[PDB]
């Protein structure tokens, strides 16, 4: 096992080290994406709600 | 083949396996992604047909 | 350069491709992101034009 | 430490050096995912108050 294909290969696993701990990051950050299509899903339901609203305030206005 | 080297390379092997597995661990938490665009892409158009709804209800009060 | 060091370090080159490709995948799934904010902050705009409407409508009401 | 075993080595870590500056490319990226999420909130809020709105003018019409 020569010493500068030892330092190579710890080199490499620093490296992969790095990626990995940066992938851990990554999914972090990806933990409010469920958080956004819940809330999103749920303005589209209350808009729903407000349209309708606005139609039965154009019926009651339309006498 | 040095059994130190071939112990570090399975090692290197393992840190890869780990890596491409959390790759797909995020690739499936953006599957969500498209879903949100398309969401919020409609909300937008149930706003403007709302804005319009609220128009004609402005018109409609001023008479 | 013995022969299994050289099959298991094509395998490590192999793995490296995939990753690679993967990260590729992730980067397009994400071209979206900037949509996403861009379409959300004309919502929230579009929303307080809204409430102005409504609160004339309130005012034009109160008479 | 045969020159070919040093040239794949090198190549190993090219292609690490690549998928890092891949992933500081997707945190970057991720960088507006938490405004995405603080938008939408207050894009909820804003309609509550204006259901609220439509329903006081409701009221005030059924008089
Ligand atoms: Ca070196
Ligand atoms: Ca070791
Ligand atoms: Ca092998
Ligand atoms: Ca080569």
Do not use: C, M, W
């Not at 589209?44 to 009651?60: A, F, M, V």
């Amino acid at each position: 096992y020569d010493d500068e294909l030892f330092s190579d290969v710890q080199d490499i696993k620093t490296a992969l080290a790095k990626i990995h701990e940066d992938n851990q990051k990554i999914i972090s950050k990806l933990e409010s994406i469920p958080k956004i299509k819940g809330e999103v899903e749920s303005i589209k339901k209350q808009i729903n709600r407000q349209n309708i609203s606005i139609s039965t305030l154009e019926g009651h206005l339309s006498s």
